[PDB]
Amino acid sequence: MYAVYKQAHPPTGLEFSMYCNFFNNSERNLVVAGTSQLYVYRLNRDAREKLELAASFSFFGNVMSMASVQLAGAKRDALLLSFKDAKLSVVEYDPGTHDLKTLSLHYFEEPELRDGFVQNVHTPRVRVDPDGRCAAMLVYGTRLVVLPFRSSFLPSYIIDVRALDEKLLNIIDLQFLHGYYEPTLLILFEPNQTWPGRVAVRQDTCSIVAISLNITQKVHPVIWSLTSLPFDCTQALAVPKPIGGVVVFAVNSLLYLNQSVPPYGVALNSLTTGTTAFPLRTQEGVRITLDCAQATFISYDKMVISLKGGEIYVLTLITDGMRSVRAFHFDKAAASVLTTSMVTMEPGYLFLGSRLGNSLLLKYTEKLLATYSFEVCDSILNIGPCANAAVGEPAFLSEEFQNSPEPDLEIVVCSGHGKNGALSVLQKSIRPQVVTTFELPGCYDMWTVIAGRRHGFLILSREDSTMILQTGQEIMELDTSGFATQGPTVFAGNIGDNRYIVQVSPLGIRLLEGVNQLHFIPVDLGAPIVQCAVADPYVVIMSAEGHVTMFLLKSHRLALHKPPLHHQSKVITLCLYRDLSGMFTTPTHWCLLVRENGTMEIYQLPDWRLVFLVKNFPVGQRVLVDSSLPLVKEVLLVALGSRQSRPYLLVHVDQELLIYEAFPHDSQLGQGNLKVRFKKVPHNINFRERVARFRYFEDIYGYSGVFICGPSPHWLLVTGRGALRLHPMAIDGPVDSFAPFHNVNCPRGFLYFNRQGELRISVLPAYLSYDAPWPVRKIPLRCTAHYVAYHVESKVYAVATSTNTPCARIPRMTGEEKEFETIERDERYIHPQQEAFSIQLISPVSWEAIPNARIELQEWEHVTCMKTVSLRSEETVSGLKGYVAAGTCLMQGEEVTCRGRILIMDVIEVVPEPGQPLTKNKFKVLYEKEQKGPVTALCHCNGHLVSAIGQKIFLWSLRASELTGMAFIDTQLYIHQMISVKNFILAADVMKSISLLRYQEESKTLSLVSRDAKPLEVYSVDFMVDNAQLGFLVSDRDRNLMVYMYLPEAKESFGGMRLLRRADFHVGAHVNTFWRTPCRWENKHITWFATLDGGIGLLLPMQEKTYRRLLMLQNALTTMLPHHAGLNPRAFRMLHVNAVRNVLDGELLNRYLYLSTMERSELAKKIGTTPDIILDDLLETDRVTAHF
């Protein structure tokens, strides 16, 4: 009855975008948002062009609207964010903590504002005056909230639009107008509503008004009004200052309005005849529709419009000598992605935000009226709306990992829509491609040194010896050389400009050019050498007692210099850094030190002077500030990104990993101090069980980053995009050591040691891209993808796709036989669309379609379902065989009876055609008969076929390509989902919830067990399996998740006739697909799902005691921490309609790992527990859910 929700993949898909001063008043940034995520980007124009990520935040809510405003005396813009059910928040960037700051939060949720209505169908909308004098917010479609600006905020008041000079009923859009001495608001509304079915009796229903707002007096009269406008107006756009006015978009018309001139309007096609009495003229050479278009202004008289279908148009306002518009000009420029928003960044730059595809950055130049041409510069990945998903096996895996007890799996999903449809292949962990393996037991550490960047030597350190190997065409051991082999080595690397090699021994340091020794320096600091660090010209070594000495490469040779360091406390670890980004200001060189008392210091290398100091480093503060126990084992400063402009800090303390990133902070305090601060980064890496653990690399398959060794190896990659990626590598086992390797037989590969003493040479597989939250490959289809299924025996995929074609005939059922009418219209008519379906096979070896393996359906036939089904067969050893089954219906309007068809297919193996090794698979149809009604759902139950035909459910038996009926039952209005476990069936209804069915084989009877008696709009269903309890998981239109149970002995079930709800959780997304897998906890399974906003989640059953223990922690975290935008985590997850609340929120529980140990212990004591128990509970769930 108890579970915990976790997020595995963040959502993708943008909905809002703007261009404002987010950081300071000298630069503007692109700000985008979608659902619960917010992003800030920068434009790097010297990389070509590239969008670079600068910040990202997440909220406990979904964003409904977005705007920005510049206040009085401020150094930044402030964002205005709107949340569902009339919430408004004002936030700003905080310099000093590198985070977000909340300025205000307003609630308008009194029941008296709703006027007795319970269901809300209106979303809050926020508009800002162009001069920054006020802001407006429309809630519930009837109340207007006004925020005056000068503290910076003045008290707000509410205006009722039903008590104006006129009565406003159905508001379509509202905008602030340019010019004017007072804030003037323009509103589109429709007092008498109509719909396209009843145009012949009610035609001109749209009106427009403008009201002038007096902030001080709180009065607001009407100054301009029009009454007779086309019934199909969609939106309005305010024209900038020099011309003024407004442009109104209609489905088949375009209008320009102003206060002192007659209106001007044109018609875009011939569908305006008999539908409007407004005076319109014909625009020559234009045949379009503007029903779902996006537009923005490029200049004071030019506009860019993105039509549905992706066509791009440029519209010019042709004016007279008195700035009076008198004509329009249309130009067809290009075609692009389907968009949800657009914004102009810089002269010649556009951004198109997409929810159904990849967001694009364009560049337009004037061709030599004016004409423009567009071009793509950059794109942002989006796995789109996840409609259907399938789980299969990867085609290729190295033979060294083919005996693993754990299965090897991958996910294939259907994404996009229309011309942007595609398939996405998703993996979570990295699997190396082993080239060769060697057995060299007895080694502890290894290094590779470059001897035009191919490694020439491999150094291996044994217990009391060192082995040297040359890496060329063949790898051979050297017995005589200038190296040291009689003792272990501490470090090996390249000094100079890759011209020399430095070898460090416990007794001294050696300088080498090739295999010939040049210089040797005995080192006796009183203790043996235990560590060494190498900068470009600098070498720093540290003894066991904390003594530090430095060497410099002088024209070459090595010279000794003694740093002037105080001895108030012993030195434990150190590292060197070379800065090429310019952020480290007071190429430069620096040194970082950690002392026994718990202080961290940073120095300049040519002259050891202090520039930074942290007093309590090991505890793990969230922000590190200049102030001028757990044991620290290792530190490392690296710079990643493009041109090495992103410094990072990695710390190994106790059994925890700390990650910090550096941001500038020019404090005006002190003199000669580093203008840098560090901020902690969240992660989920566990170190719970001198050889370095962090190993920097560059150019491994074109990537640079850091490899993290240990019990749970991880990859750390930052590309020119600027986003941090953490990819696990759990195959094989814990990794001992790691090194890059560039050879002729291993182009841009790497080396690592297994814990069994095996040395593996590997390369990264080349069919995935690792610059994403998960490694992913996208296969474009240029058409909509509906269903995907995996055939186990043949190891191929079947996909049902659709494409659009013009409609030409209207079916009729008036006579004895079906008749058709040919549509006859003029040359300016817009044809309706018609869809055609197909099924094709995809091969996983190369993600391409198999030729001559395509199935085409009839003219008006739609695929309603397609699944892999296991049926009875007397030809195997288990009694079952796999097939692909589909159901179809013919759609020809409401006045023709709808009937369907059932298809059963098999995949066989044939002789491949010459010069075509991919044509060894083909379809084989066994059953293609028509039924007495529409087929809406399919399933299998203990070897039989289950189908929903009309308002009945049938079971069939297949023998020699014939279906025989066995049983039937009456059901509800419309069944669109069915699942089965053992001999039970779960059926979902469009409007009447779910029901449970049972089948008895001996008597061949189908019966109803129980059902839910309350209405519900179901999206999808699945199961929950803990040990012996069976639960039914249901999706909702209101974005909820519920669990139902069958409890005959409970008094509220009325003897078992009603299903009882037992769990509740509000996720802010729609779910349309489910799948299950076992735990990586005896007989428990995990239920995964994918959302229509591009995310991935899961639910994991939990024991009662652990749930009750973690509920107190959840409550404490809710009540004792601040949250972004001032939102409440507990209210967000509450069910939207009594709730039962038996599910934990795993994203809020992650905040316990982000705290420092001091506040962790402080919080644990407040609820009477121990941090160790909480950590164990939190890490067990992370351990048991590591799949894919």
Partner: peptide, 14 residues
């Protein structure tokens, strides 16, 4: 328009 071998290495160990 606008919408964006194996075992080849031998170890001659002494």
């Amino acid at each position: 328009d606008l919408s964006d071998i194996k075992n080849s290495i031998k170890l001659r160990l002494n």
